[PDB]
mmCIF file with all atom_site columns, C-alpha atoms in Angstrom:
data_model
loop_
_atom_site.group_PDB
_atom_site.id
_atom_site.type_symbol
_atom_site.label_atom_id
_atom_site.label_alt_id
_atom_site.label_comp_id
_atom_site.label_asym_id
_atom_site.label_entity_id
_atom_site.label_seq_id
_atom_site.pdbx_PDB_ins_code
_atom_site.Cartn_x
_atom_site.Cartn_y
_atom_site.Cartn_z
_atom_site.occupancy
_atom_site.B_iso_or_equiv
_atom_site.pdbx_formal_charge
_atom_site.auth_seq_id
_atom_site.auth_comp_id
_atom_site.auth_asym_id
_atom_site.auth_atom_id
_atom_site.pdbx_PDB_model_num
ATOM 1   C CA . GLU I 1 1  ? 102.782 112.243 67.667  1.00 0.00 ? 1  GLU I CA 1
ATOM 2   C CA . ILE I 1 2  ? 101.815 114.498 70.658  1.00 0.00 ? 2  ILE I CA 1
ATOM 3   C CA . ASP I 1 3  ? 97.983  114.425 70.150  1.00 0.00 ? 3  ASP I CA 1
ATOM 4   C CA . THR I 1 4  ? 97.919  110.578 70.057  1.00 0.00 ? 4  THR I CA 1
ATOM 5   C CA . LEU I 1 5  ? 100.166 110.529 73.192  1.00 0.00 ? 5  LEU I CA 1
ATOM 6   C CA . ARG I 1 6  ? 97.826  113.088 74.870  1.00 0.00 ? 6  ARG I CA 1
ATOM 7   C CA . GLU I 1 7  ? 94.764  110.922 74.122  1.00 0.00 ? 7  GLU I CA 1
ATOM 8   C CA . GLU I 1 8  ? 96.657  107.858 75.572  1.00 0.00 ? 8  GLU I CA 1
ATOM 9   C CA . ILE I 1 9  ? 97.181  109.966 78.799  1.00 0.00 ? 9  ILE I CA 1
ATOM 10  C CA . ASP I 1 10 ? 93.490  110.872 78.985  1.00 0.00 ? 10 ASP I CA 1
ATOM 11  C CA . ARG I 1 11 ? 92.525  107.115 78.619  1.00 0.00 ? 11 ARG I CA 1
ATOM 12  C CA . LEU I 1 12 ? 95.077  106.151 81.356  1.00 0.00 ? 12 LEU I CA 1
ATOM 13  C CA . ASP I 1 13 ? 93.655  108.824 83.743  1.00 0.00 ? 13 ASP I CA 1
ATOM 14  C CA . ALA I 1 14 ? 90.056  107.666 83.177  1.00 0.00 ? 14 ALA I CA 1
ATOM 15  C CA . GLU I 1 15 ? 91.135  104.121 84.177  1.00 0.00 ? 15 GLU I CA 1
ATOM 16  C CA . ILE I 1 16 ? 93.259  105.287 87.151  1.00 0.00 ? 16 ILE I CA 1
ATOM 17  C CA . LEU I 1 17 ? 90.473  107.554 88.557  1.00 0.00 ? 17 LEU I CA 1
ATOM 18  C CA . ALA I 1 18 ? 87.883  104.774 88.317  1.00 0.00 ? 18 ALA I CA 1
ATOM 19  C CA . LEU I 1 19 ? 90.187  102.292 90.096  1.00 0.00 ? 19 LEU I CA 1
ATOM 20  C CA . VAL I 1 20 ? 91.218  104.790 92.824  1.00 0.00 ? 20 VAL I CA 1
ATOM 21  C CA . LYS I 1 21 ? 87.548  105.645 93.559  1.00 0.00 ? 21 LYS I CA 1
ATOM 22  C CA . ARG I 1 22 ? 86.837  101.898 93.912  1.00 0.00 ? 22 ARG I CA 1
ATOM 23  C CA . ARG I 1 23 ? 89.964  101.399 96.075  1.00 0.00 ? 23 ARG I CA 1
ATOM 24  C CA . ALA I 1 24 ? 88.706  104.264 98.381  1.00 0.00 ? 24 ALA I CA 1
ATOM 25  C CA . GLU I 1 25 ? 85.290  102.521 98.746  1.00 0.00 ? 25 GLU I CA 1
ATOM 26  C CA . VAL I 1 26 ? 86.837  99.067  99.455  1.00 0.00 ? 26 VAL I CA 1
ATOM 27  C CA . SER I 1 27 ? 89.380  100.506 101.982 1.00 0.00 ? 27 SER I CA 1
ATOM 28  C CA . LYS I 1 28 ? 86.506  102.313 103.774 1.00 0.00 ? 28 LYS I CA 1
ATOM 29  C CA . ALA I 1 29 ? 84.666  98.938  104.017 1.00 0.00 ? 29 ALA I CA 1
ATOM 30  C CA . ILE I 1 30 ? 87.862  97.205  105.402 1.00 0.00 ? 30 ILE I CA 1
ATOM 31  C CA . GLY I 1 31 ? 88.060  100.110 107.955 1.00 0.00 ? 31 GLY I CA 1
ATOM 32  C CA . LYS I 1 32 ? 84.380  99.568  109.006 1.00 0.00 ? 32 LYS I CA 1
ATOM 33  C CA . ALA I 1 33 ? 85.007  95.780  109.402 1.00 0.00 ? 33 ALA I CA 1
ATOM 34  C CA . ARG I 1 34 ? 88.207  96.459  111.471 1.00 0.00 ? 34 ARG I CA 1
ATOM 35  C CA . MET I 1 35 ? 86.551  98.948  113.898 1.00 0.00 ? 35 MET I CA 1
ATOM 36  C CA . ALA I 1 36 ? 83.368  96.730  113.959 1.00 0.00 ? 36 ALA I CA 1
ATOM 37  C CA . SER I 1 37 ? 85.527  93.791  115.281 1.00 0.00 ? 37 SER I CA 1
ATOM 38  C CA . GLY I 1 38 ? 88.344  95.671  117.176 1.00 0.00 ? 38 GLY I CA 1
ATOM 39  C CA . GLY I 1 39 ? 91.772  94.222  116.201 1.00 0.00 ? 39 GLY I CA 1
ATOM 40  C CA . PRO I 1 40 ? 94.787  96.433  115.385 1.00 0.00 ? 40 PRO I CA 1
ATOM 41  C CA . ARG I 1 41 ? 95.217  98.212  112.069 1.00 0.00 ? 41 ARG I CA 1
ATOM 42  C CA . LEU I 1 42 ? 97.736  96.410  109.852 1.00 0.00 ? 42 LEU I CA 1
ATOM 43  C CA . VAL I 1 43 ? 100.125 99.354  109.493 1.00 0.00 ? 43 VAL I CA 1
ATOM 44  C CA . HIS I 1 44 ? 103.456 97.567  109.768 1.00 0.00 ? 44 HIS I CA 1
ATOM 45  C CA . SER I 1 45 ? 102.437 94.447  107.789 1.00 0.00 ? 45 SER I CA 1
ATOM 46  C CA . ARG I 1 46 ? 99.852  95.185  105.078 1.00 0.00 ? 46 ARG I CA 1
ATOM 47  C CA . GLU I 1 47 ? 100.126 99.014  104.707 1.00 0.00 ? 47 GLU I CA 1
ATOM 48  C CA . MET I 1 48 ? 103.954 98.860  104.584 1.00 0.00 ? 48 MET I CA 1
ATOM 49  C CA . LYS I 1 49 ? 103.730 96.199  101.797 1.00 0.00 ? 49 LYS I CA 1
ATOM 50  C CA . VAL I 1 50 ? 101.431 98.562  99.777  1.00 0.00 ? 50 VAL I CA 1
ATOM 51  C CA . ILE I 1 51 ? 103.987 101.415 100.189 1.00 0.00 ? 51 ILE I CA 1
ATOM 52  C CA . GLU I 1 52 ? 106.786 98.967  99.150  1.00 0.00 ? 52 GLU I CA 1
ATOM 53  C CA . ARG I 1 53 ? 104.760 97.875  96.049  1.00 0.00 ? 53 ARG I CA 1
ATOM 54  C CA . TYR I 1 54 ? 104.439 101.517 94.807  1.00 0.00 ? 54 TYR I CA 1
ATOM 55  C CA . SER I 1 55 ? 108.092 102.322 95.842  1.00 0.00 ? 55 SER I CA 1
ATOM 56  C CA . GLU I 1 56 ? 109.052 100.517 92.547  1.00 0.00 ? 56 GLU I CA 1
ATOM 57  C CA . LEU I 1 57 ? 108.075 103.934 90.989  1.00 0.00 ? 57 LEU I CA 1
ATOM 58  C CA . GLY I 1 58 ? 110.596 105.869 93.191  1.00 0.00 ? 58 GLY I CA 1
ATOM 59  C CA . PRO I 1 59 ? 109.925 108.215 96.174  1.00 0.00 ? 59 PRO I CA 1
ATOM 60  C CA . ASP I 1 60 ? 107.001 109.933 94.434  1.00 0.00 ? 60 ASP I CA 1
ATOM 61  C CA . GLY I 1 61 ? 105.738 106.276 94.396  1.00 0.00 ? 61 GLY I CA 1
ATOM 62  C CA . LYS I 1 62 ? 105.982 105.999 98.206  1.00 0.00 ? 62 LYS I CA 1
ATOM 63  C CA . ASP I 1 63 ? 104.000 109.267 98.531  1.00 0.00 ? 63 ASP I CA 1
ATOM 64  C CA . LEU I 1 64 ? 101.383 107.967 96.038  1.00 0.00 ? 64 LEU I CA 1
ATOM 65  C CA . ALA I 1 65 ? 100.791 104.874 98.233  1.00 0.00 ? 65 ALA I CA 1
ATOM 66  C CA . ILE I 1 66 ? 100.484 107.112 101.336 1.00 0.00 ? 66 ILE I CA 1
ATOM 67  C CA . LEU I 1 67 ? 97.777  109.195 99.595  1.00 0.00 ? 67 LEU I CA 1
ATOM 68  C CA . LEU I 1 68 ? 95.879  106.038 98.449  1.00 0.00 ? 68 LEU I CA 1
ATOM 69  C CA . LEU I 1 69 ? 95.822  104.862 102.107 1.00 0.00 ? 69 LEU I CA 1
ATOM 70  C CA . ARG I 1 70 ? 94.445  108.337 103.177 1.00 0.00 ? 70 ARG I CA 1
ATOM 71  C CA . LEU I 1 71 ? 91.663  108.095 100.593 1.00 0.00 ? 71 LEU I CA 1
ATOM 72  C CA . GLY I 1 72 ? 90.452  104.944 102.382 1.00 0.00 ? 72 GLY I CA 1
ATOM 73  C CA . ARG I 1 73 ? 89.797  106.768 105.723 1.00 0.00 ? 73 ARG I CA 1
ATOM 74  C CA . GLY I 1 74 ? 86.258  106.817 107.263 1.00 0.00 ? 74 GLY I CA 1
ATOM 75  C CA . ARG I 1 75 ? 84.073  109.964 107.253 1.00 0.00 ? 75 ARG I CA 1
ATOM 76  C CA . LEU I 1 76 ? 81.065  110.473 109.737 1.00 0.00 ? 76 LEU I CA 1
ATOM 77  C CA . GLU H 1 1  ? 84.290  89.547  104.551 1.00 0.00 ? 1  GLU H CA 1
ATOM 78  C CA . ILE H 1 2  ? 87.759  91.142  105.183 1.00 0.00 ? 2  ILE H CA 1
ATOM 79  C CA . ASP H 1 3  ? 89.879  88.579  103.211 1.00 0.00 ? 3  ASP H CA 1
ATOM 80  C CA . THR H 1 4  ? 87.705  88.980  100.061 1.00 0.00 ? 4  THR H CA 1
ATOM 81  C CA . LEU H 1 5  ? 87.913  92.809  100.483 1.00 0.00 ? 5  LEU H CA 1
ATOM 82  C CA . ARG H 1 6  ? 91.726  92.519  100.939 1.00 0.00 ? 6  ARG H CA 1
ATOM 83  C CA . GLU H 1 7  ? 92.053  90.473  97.724  1.00 0.00 ? 7  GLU H CA 1
ATOM 84  C CA . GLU H 1 8  ? 89.895  93.130  95.891  1.00 0.00 ? 8  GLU H CA 1
ATOM 85  C CA . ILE H 1 9  ? 92.459  95.777  97.138  1.00 0.00 ? 9  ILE H CA 1
ATOM 86  C CA . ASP H 1 10 ? 95.410  93.729  95.878  1.00 0.00 ? 10 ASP H CA 1
ATOM 87  C CA . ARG H 1 11 ? 93.712  93.388  92.387  1.00 0.00 ? 11 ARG H CA 1
ATOM 88  C CA . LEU H 1 12 ? 93.001  97.185  92.317  1.00 0.00 ? 12 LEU H CA 1
ATOM 89  C CA . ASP H 1 13 ? 96.672  97.976  93.189  1.00 0.00 ? 13 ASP H CA 1
ATOM 90  C CA . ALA H 1 14 ? 98.003  95.642  90.469  1.00 0.00 ? 14 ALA H CA 1
ATOM 91  C CA . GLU H 1 15 ? 95.852  97.537  87.917  1.00 0.00 ? 15 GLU H CA 1
ATOM 92  C CA . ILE H 1 16 ? 96.738  101.003 89.302  1.00 0.00 ? 16 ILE H CA 1
ATOM 93  C CA . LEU H 1 17 ? 100.526 100.280 89.348  1.00 0.00 ? 17 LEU H CA 1
ATOM 94  C CA . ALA H 1 18 ? 100.476 98.996  85.764  1.00 0.00 ? 18 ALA H CA 1
ATOM 95  C CA . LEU H 1 19 ? 98.560  102.075 84.547  1.00 0.00 ? 19 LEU H CA 1
ATOM 96  C CA . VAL H 1 20 ? 100.758 104.547 86.496  1.00 0.00 ? 20 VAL H CA 1
ATOM 97  C CA . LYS H 1 21 ? 103.957 102.966 85.078  1.00 0.00 ? 21 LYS H CA 1
ATOM 98  C CA . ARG H 1 22 ? 102.484 103.353 81.563  1.00 0.00 ? 22 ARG H CA 1
ATOM 99  C CA . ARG H 1 23 ? 101.366 106.945 82.310  1.00 0.00 ? 23 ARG H CA 1
ATOM 100 C CA . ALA H 1 24 ? 104.999 107.735 83.445  1.00 0.00 ? 24 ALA H CA 1
ATOM 101 C CA . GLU H 1 25 ? 106.378 106.342 80.128  1.00 0.00 ? 25 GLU H CA 1
ATOM 102 C CA . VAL H 1 26 ? 103.827 108.251 77.965  1.00 0.00 ? 26 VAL H CA 1
ATOM 103 C CA . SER H 1 27 ? 104.364 111.553 79.899  1.00 0.00 ? 27 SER H CA 1
ATOM 104 C CA . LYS H 1 28 ? 108.153 111.156 79.434  1.00 0.00 ? 28 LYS H CA 1
ATOM 105 C CA . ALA H 1 29 ? 107.549 110.767 75.650  1.00 0.00 ? 29 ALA H CA 1
ATOM 106 C CA . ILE H 1 30 ? 105.280 113.927 75.607  1.00 0.00 ? 30 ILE H CA 1
ATOM 107 C CA . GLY H 1 31 ? 108.142 115.734 77.488  1.00 0.00 ? 31 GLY H CA 1
ATOM 108 C CA . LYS H 1 32 ? 110.729 114.591 74.852  1.00 0.00 ? 32 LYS H CA 1
ATOM 109 C CA . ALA H 1 33 ? 108.407 115.772 72.002  1.00 0.00 ? 33 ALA H CA 1
ATOM 110 C CA . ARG H 1 34 ? 107.857 119.171 73.770  1.00 0.00 ? 34 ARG H CA 1
ATOM 111 C CA . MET H 1 35 ? 111.594 119.887 74.358  1.00 0.00 ? 35 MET H CA 1
ATOM 112 C CA . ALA H 1 36 ? 112.397 118.440 70.849  1.00 0.00 ? 36 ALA H CA 1
ATOM 113 C CA . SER H 1 37 ? 110.073 121.125 69.288  1.00 0.00 ? 37 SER H CA 1
ATOM 114 C CA . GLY H 1 38 ? 110.349 124.005 71.874  1.00 0.00 ? 38 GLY H CA 1
ATOM 115 C CA . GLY H 1 39 ? 106.842 125.335 72.735  1.00 0.00 ? 39 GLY H CA 1
ATOM 116 C CA . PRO H 1 40 ? 105.742 126.072 76.326  1.00 0.00 ? 40 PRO H CA 1
ATOM 117 C CA . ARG H 1 41 ? 104.714 123.372 78.775  1.00 0.00 ? 41 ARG H CA 1
ATOM 118 C CA . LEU H 1 42 ? 100.927 123.222 79.156  1.00 0.00 ? 42 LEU H CA 1
ATOM 119 C CA . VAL H 1 43 ? 100.879 123.882 82.906  1.00 0.00 ? 43 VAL H CA 1
ATOM 120 C CA . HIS H 1 44 ? 97.907  126.220 83.150  1.00 0.00 ? 44 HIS H CA 1
ATOM 121 C CA . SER H 1 45 ? 95.748  124.448 80.525  1.00 0.00 ? 45 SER H CA 1
ATOM 122 C CA . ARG H 1 46 ? 96.367  120.683 80.387  1.00 0.00 ? 46 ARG H CA 1
ATOM 123 C CA . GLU H 1 47 ? 98.152  120.024 83.742  1.00 0.00 ? 47 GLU H CA 1
ATOM 124 C CA . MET H 1 48 ? 95.572  122.101 85.673  1.00 0.00 ? 48 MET H CA 1
ATOM 125 C CA . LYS H 1 49 ? 92.739  120.056 84.032  1.00 0.00 ? 49 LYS H CA 1
ATOM 126 C CA . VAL H 1 50 ? 94.457  116.798 85.212  1.00 0.00 ? 50 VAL H CA 1
ATOM 127 C CA . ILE H 1 51 ? 94.661  118.194 88.797  1.00 0.00 ? 51 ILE H CA 1
ATOM 128 C CA . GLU H 1 52 ? 90.957  119.248 88.524  1.00 0.00 ? 52 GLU H CA 1
ATOM 129 C CA . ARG H 1 53 ? 89.984  115.724 87.281  1.00 0.00 ? 53 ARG H CA 1
ATOM 130 C CA . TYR H 1 54 ? 91.580  114.045 90.370  1.00 0.00 ? 54 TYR H CA 1
ATOM 131 C CA . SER H 1 55 ? 90.265  116.838 92.722  1.00 0.00 ? 55 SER H CA 1
ATOM 132 C CA . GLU H 1 56 ? 86.894  114.932 92.525  1.00 0.00 ? 56 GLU H CA 1
ATOM 133 C CA . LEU H 1 57 ? 88.612  112.656 95.156  1.00 0.00 ? 57 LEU H CA 1
ATOM 134 C CA . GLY H 1 58 ? 89.269  115.613 97.557  1.00 0.00 ? 58 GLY H CA 1
ATOM 135 C CA . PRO H 1 59 ? 92.597  117.357 98.422  1.00 0.00 ? 59 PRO H CA 1
ATOM 136 C CA . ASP H 1 60 ? 94.496  114.062 98.679  1.00 0.00 ? 60 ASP H CA 1
ATOM 137 C CA . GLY H 1 61 ? 93.218  113.807 95.035  1.00 0.00 ? 61 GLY H CA 1
ATOM 138 C CA . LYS H 1 62 ? 94.927  117.088 94.053  1.00 0.00 ? 62 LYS H CA 1
ATOM 139 C CA . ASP H 1 63 ? 98.195  115.803 95.593  1.00 0.00 ? 63 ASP H CA 1
ATOM 140 C CA . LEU H 1 64 ? 97.802  112.469 93.726  1.00 0.00 ? 64 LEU H CA 1
ATOM 141 C CA . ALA H 1 65 ? 97.599  114.337 90.379  1.00 0.00 ? 65 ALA H CA 1
ATOM 142 C CA . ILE H 1 66 ? 100.698 116.398 91.320  1.00 0.00 ? 66 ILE H CA 1
ATOM 143 C CA . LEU H 1 67 ? 102.665 113.176 91.990  1.00 0.00 ? 67 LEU H CA 1
ATOM 144 C CA . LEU H 1 68 ? 101.484 111.594 88.675  1.00 0.00 ? 68 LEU H CA 1
ATOM 145 C CA . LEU H 1 69 ? 102.797 114.701 86.836  1.00 0.00 ? 69 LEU H CA 1
ATOM 146 C CA . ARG H 1 70 ? 106.193 114.335 88.692  1.00 0.00 ? 70 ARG H CA 1
ATOM 147 C CA . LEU H 1 71 ? 106.453 110.694 87.622  1.00 0.00 ? 71 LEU H CA 1
ATOM 148 C CA . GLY H 1 72 ? 106.394 111.892 83.993  1.00 0.00 ? 72 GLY H CA 1
ATOM 149 C CA . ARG H 1 73 ? 109.607 114.004 84.357  1.00 0.00 ? 73 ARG H CA 1
ATOM 150 C CA . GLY H 1 74 ? 112.695 113.262 82.165  1.00 0.00 ? 74 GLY H CA 1
ATOM 151 C CA . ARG H 1 75 ? 115.848 111.603 83.576  1.00 0.00 ? 75 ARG H CA 1
ATOM 152 C CA . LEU H 1 76 ? 119.358 111.869 81.819  1.00 0.00 ? 76 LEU H CA 1
#
């Protein structure tokens, strides 16, 4: 029944938004700790593994991982 | 400490991936029920509200909502 399915979607989006906001805050912290310690960014090791993880969803999955990594970027 | 922050990221991504997979399955169902009942797609009402919800994250947020809606599209 559509309305039950719709309310399942709204529950899923509440959970996703909360987790993405937290992921953005944690990534920002990791960024601070990288810059405040030098050392290269882990693009080809760790970031590529994150993109591969979400690639299980298909190519819109790869793009989703790319946006999550953008959300973790430092602001002045 | 980086390694603790890194393990928090990996926990957050496990949760996000599980919820996105479920959201894809539920959206597909809503799609089936729409087609199998006619009626217009709720682009300007419901989909726009989902994009607005994720827009709280910034423009990468708008793009994230667009990809979540794509993941819900029917396959033969």
